[PDB]
Design a protein around this nucleic acid. Structure first.
Length: 49
DNA sequence: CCGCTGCCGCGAATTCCGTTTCAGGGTACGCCTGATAATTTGCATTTTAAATACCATTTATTGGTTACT
């Protein structure tokens, strides 16, 4: 709290990180590593636009 | 105070054939670091123009002359 910021501002980053890291590790039968998941997500975001 | 309702379970033929093996989620980014998977040399075993060291039984040259168109 010494930083003087609202709690939610800090907490949201950790929550997003945890959720996304898990959805990368689990959720596939054959486990693609994290970095490849990031690259595939970039690929898909570029393809739509 | 031993009757009836209402829930929930469970089941519904046989072979072949055909066919599109097929798609859909809507969320970030940049560091250190060890952790494998690549790539680089030497040493065991073949295989060595062949070269080599002995046994082998079977023709070859043979030892030519004594009879004689």
């Amino acid at each position: 709290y010494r930083r003087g910021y609202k709690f939610s501002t800090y907490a949201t980053w950790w929550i997003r990180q945890a959720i996304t890291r898990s959805i990368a590790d689990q959720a596939r039968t054959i486990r693609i590593p994290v970095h490849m998941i990031e690259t595939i997500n970039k690929l898909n975001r570029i393809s739509r636009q």
